[PDB]
Design a protein around this nucleic acid. Structure first.
Ligand SMILES: O=c1ccn([C@H]2C[C@H](O)[C@@H](COP(=O)(O)NP(=O)(O)OP(=O)(O)O)O2)c(=O)[nH]1
Ligand SMILES: [Mn+2]
Ligand SMILES: [Mn+2]
Ligand SMILES: [Mn+2]
Ligand SMILES: [Mn+2]
Ligand SMILES: [Mn+2]
Ligand SMILES: [Mn+2]
Ligand SMILES: [Mn+2]
Length: 901
DNA sequence: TCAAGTAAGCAGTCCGCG
DNA sequence: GCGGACTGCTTAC
């Protein structure tokens, strides 16, 4: 096969590379790499090398990397540009792998581990590692085995060996329920002493040295803890055996209060799964314990036990070891669903970067663009310094707050990059400028046409129409990948609705799920075979379809994030191709397109409805329009459809047949106007929304910008079995809203939209009567905790102290002295509850870390003092008043000028 | 040169107010 | 007790 790399590092004048050779074997090599950089020279020069502007360049071949750096610095001291790729590991990979890399993931050792450390005296600080490591479980993807290192004797208790037969039993039969499909994959190794355990771990690590290293929080706890514990017992140089080149960086910062640590292990690409999840998952969780996310992602149950984890090894070593194995497996399960490692690998190899660089869009694109330029024998510009300048972004229309019964929506496909391709925006396609009118004049087609010769944006920029840009070119490739995957995703989603519907009519037999690809729309024969399957079969198919759709989501939305990352990068001073002219060319064009198309859609709709000067477009954000369909529905009545699906079918046809072509005509005109290279403003229909036919529902409402709810029947061609609420911005969407209040406001909204005022009130009365019976954690607010120290001391609230930060201080005073209480962590999220006046805490609110019950120390007298009246009003009534005042309903009634028996 | 962007809502603090 | 200027956080895009 063709070779590919695993890791690369720069060590002085040395590149260290781990790689897979042409035979499939893992190898390592040290290369004294000779880098090249370039300098402009006179046009009188025989040279194949030009920079991206067409200026001639001469190559300088250096004997080592140190020299290249030295030269770069003299060039600055002289004031002349030093061109070329200055991140030498990137250039090396580009020289070494001059082809599209087809990697083979079964040869990439992916490791996943979790450690346990008993700690009677508070959270075990990694920067100190003063406690024994009493368990490690380490899964190796190539062995497909879980290696378990278990400490039987430690100064914190002697325990006997762990039992694999008891691990397997149902929890109800006294077992730990280690899932059956991994029981056979476990390899168990007890140890009399910590030293022999760590020694043996290090020996294992050498034989099976991770390429990709993951886990939950491994970056902040496991890795630094292991590194520092090995250091303390054996010395640093032994601790350095964790790096395949024996080099590490610490790192630092710290800082207070009181200390944290991050180790860098050269020759390993660490991808902490919690980071992969934050970047790639597009959720905002109230908490990031493995148990919360596992439950969220997998629908598995909380990992139950009695007593604090500081006594768990002692009271029940058996469960302790089993829960350690399970945590590792759980991260394996989250990844089989989300597929973030596979994505990281796709992106990393595509860009030709270090796999951990996928966290960096700027770095990812620097390498993609660099590689694309080096193929044409071109020379990248030097990275310059720039001051940080704010600049204008998208347009958002101000909506009239109201209920809106029937609404269709339309949204532009991949807007920013589409713009980049339509206008042909690139550092090296800049043609000149033109004198700019106010933006309203373009939108209204009254300003003079910018140019006859160049592609333009209403920010005043002009671009060459003939030559293609490195940016448009490379941004198209990734776009095309996103398109593909989105299709798989949507198809799996439609396939999902078809299965759901068939679940209304099983159908009693004994069968197997059909063998099919959920990435493509079910054929008619397949649809036939399905209408005759059992509930078992069909449920297995729904699961499979929903997993194919999740995979499609991951692959498509993150490819979109990448491309959008490029547009935003142009506005980041650390980006080699930073340039506000390009950044604003994109954004300003986007504001124009949205407002232009608003005008056009109003013009077309007034026409066909024969009416005049009426607003059909009710809202719009960046690249979307929301269209009232009341008068399109009314033009016909009402009657006059048989059921909901009928009018949905109507509007669908009307969008596809009448509106779609006028929109396209509208944007075709806009393209001509700006004389663009290619027409790519494609605005597909999104939601079709309204109340169930016959009901008293309102269908939808806006309260303001970025705050609306819609009852949707069809979404971008997916006709839903049951109506699905599209809620944007409302408290139901905010991670800081208590879980139970989220659910309650959602149900209030479901009612308003589907059933009307009377149903709303009915439910609101019930929730008020029952509020106080809820679990305290389900009605607690949530907040991130930044810049905490600032608002001490000592330790009481200082001036301007935020409410949640106040709660942490109240917590910090409550737990002063008890070495057992779990500590709030700077930058982490916290639960927050208000307290009644006269509480023994001495203030109006308390806060503890999230995803955790509050410590039994103070728990009992927090419950006693929680202020329900304030909670309900703050988190539930205020926001509800918002919704209903906007949609002109009341949640209570209402003094009716009656009343009477 | 370790480093995608802007727009904009709401909850809270501090101050004003016979 | 309510509205205006500010911080802090959080979504929508
Ligand atoms: O995180 C984002 C999201 C969107 N945007 C910009 C770019 C995007 O093209 C534009 C429109 O927002 P959408 O949510 O519609 N995404 P896009 O149009 O790219 O993709 P699509 O509509 O095809 O899903 O807003 C960002 O700059 N950053
Ligand atoms: Mn024994
Ligand atoms: Mn059970
Ligand atoms: Mn654990
Ligand atoms: Mn969309
Ligand atoms: Mn869009
Ligand atoms: Mn779309
Ligand atoms: Mn959009």
């Amino acid at each position: 096969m063709k070779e590919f790399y695993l890791t690369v590092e720069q060590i002085g004048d040395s590149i260290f590379e781990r790689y897979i050779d042409s035979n499939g074997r893992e190898r390592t090599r040290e290369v004294e790499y000779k880098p090249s950089l370039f300098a402009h020279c006179p046009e009188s020069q025989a040279t194949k090398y030009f920079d991206i502007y067409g200026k001639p360049c001469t190559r300088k071949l250096f004997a080592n990397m140190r020299d290249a750096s030295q030269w770069i610095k003299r060039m600055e001291d002289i004031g002349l540009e030093a061109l070329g790729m200055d991140d030498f590991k990137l250039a090396y990979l580009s020289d070494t792998y001059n082809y599209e890399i087809k990697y083979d993931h079964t040869k990439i050792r992916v490791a996943n581990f979790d450690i346990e450390v008993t700690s009677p005296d508070g959270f075990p600080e990694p920067s100190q590692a003063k406690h024994p490591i009493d368990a490690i479980t380490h899964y190796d993807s190539i062995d497909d085995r879980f290696y378990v290192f278990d400490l039987l004797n430690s100064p914190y208790g002697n325990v006997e060996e762990w039992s694999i037969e008891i691990a397997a039993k149902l929890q109800e039969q006294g077992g730990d329920e280690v899932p059956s499909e991994i029981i056979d994959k476990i390899i168990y190794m007890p140890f009399d002493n910590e030293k022999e355990l760590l020694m043996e771990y290090l020996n294992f690590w050498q034989q099976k040295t991770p390429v990709i290293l993951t886990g939950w929080n491994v970056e902040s706890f496991a890795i630094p803890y292991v590194y520092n514990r090995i250091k303390n017992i054996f010395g640093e140089s032994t601790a350095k055996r964790l790096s395949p080149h024996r080099k590490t960086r610490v790192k630092v910062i710290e800082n207070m209060y009181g200390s944290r640590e991050i180790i860098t292990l050269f020759g390993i690409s660490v991808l902490d799964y919690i980071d992969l999840y934050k970047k790639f998952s597009f959720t905002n969780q109230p908490s990031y314990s493995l148990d919360y996310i596992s439950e969220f992602e997998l629908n598995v149950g909380k990992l139950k036990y009695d007593g604090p984890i500081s006594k768990l090894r002692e009271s029940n070593h058996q469960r302790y070891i089993s829960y350690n194995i399970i945590a590792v497996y759980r991260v394996l399960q989250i990844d089989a669903k989300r597929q973030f490692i596979n994505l990281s690998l796709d992106m990393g190899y595509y860009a030709k970067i270090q796999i951990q660089s996928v966290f960096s869009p700027i770095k990812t694109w620097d390498a993609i663009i660099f590689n694309s330029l080096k193929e044409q024998n071109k020379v990248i510009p030097q990275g310059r310094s720039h001051p940080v300048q704010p600049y204008p972004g998208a347009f958002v229309k101000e909506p009239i707050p109201n209920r809106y019964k029937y609404v269709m929506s339309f949204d532009l496909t991949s807007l920013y990059p589409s713009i980049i391709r339509q206008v042909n925006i690139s550092p090296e396609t800049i043609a000149g400028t033109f004198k700019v009118a106010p933006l309203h004049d373009y939108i209204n087609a009254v300003a003079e046409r910018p140019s006859d010769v160049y592609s333009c944006s209403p920010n005043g920029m002009m671009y060459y129409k003939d030559r293609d840009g490195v940016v448009p070119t490379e941004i198209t490739k990734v776009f095309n990948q996103r398109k593909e995957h989105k299709g798989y995703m949507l198809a799996a989603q439609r396939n999902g609705e078809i299965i759901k519907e068939a679940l209304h009519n099983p159908n009693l037999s004994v069968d197997e799920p059909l063998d099919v690809d959920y990435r493509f729309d079910f054929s008619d024969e397949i649809k036939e075979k399905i209408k005759k399957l059992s509930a078992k079969s069909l449920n297995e198919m729904l699961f499979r379809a929903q997993r194919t759709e999740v995979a499609g989501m991951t692959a498509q939305i993150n490819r979109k994030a990448l491309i959008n990352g490029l547009a935003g990068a142009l506005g980041n001073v650390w980006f080699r191709y930073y340039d506000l002219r390009n950044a604003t060319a994109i954004t300003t064009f986007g504001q124009m397109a949205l407002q232009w198309i608003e005008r056009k859609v109003n013009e077309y709709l007034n026409e066909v409805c024969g009416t005049e000067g009426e607003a059909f477009v009710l809202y719009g954000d960046t690249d979307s329009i929301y269209v009232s369909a009341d008068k399109i529905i009314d033009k016909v009545g009402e009657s006059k459809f048989r059921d909901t699906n009928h009018w949905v079918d109507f509007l669908d046809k009307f969008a596809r047949e009448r509106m779609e072509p006028a929109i396209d005509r509208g944007f075709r005109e806009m393209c001509e106007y700006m004389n663009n290279k290619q027409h790519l403003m494609f605005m597909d229909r999104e939601a079709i929304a309204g109340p169930p036919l016959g009901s008293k529902g309102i269908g939808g409402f806006w309260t303001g910008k970025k705050r609306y709810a819609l009852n949707v029947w069809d979404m971008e061609g997916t006709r839903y079995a049951e109506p699905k609420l599209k809620i944007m911005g409302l408290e139901t969407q905010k991670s800081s809203t208590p879980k139970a209040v989220q659910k309650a406001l959602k149900e209030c909204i479901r009612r308003m939209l589907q059933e009307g005022e009377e149903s709303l009130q009915e439910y609101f009365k019930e929730f008020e009567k029952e509020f106080r019976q809820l679990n305290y954690i389900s009605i607690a607010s949530v907040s991130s905790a930044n810049n905490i120290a600032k608002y001490d001391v000592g330790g009481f609230p200082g001036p301007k102290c935020p409410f949640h930060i106040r709660g942490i201080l109240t917590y910090n005073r409550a737990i002063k002295g008890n070495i057992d209480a779990p500590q709030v962590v700077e930058g982490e999220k916290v639960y927050v509850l208000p307290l009644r006046e006269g509480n023994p805490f001495g203030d109006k609110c308390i806060a503890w870390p999230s995803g955790t019950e509050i410590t039994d120390l103070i728990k009992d007298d927090v419950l006693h003092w929680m202020d329900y009246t304030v909670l309900l009003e703050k988190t539930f009534i205020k926001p509800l008043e918002g919704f209903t005042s906007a949609a002109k309903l009341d949640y209570e009634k209402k003094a009716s000028l009656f009343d009477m028996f």
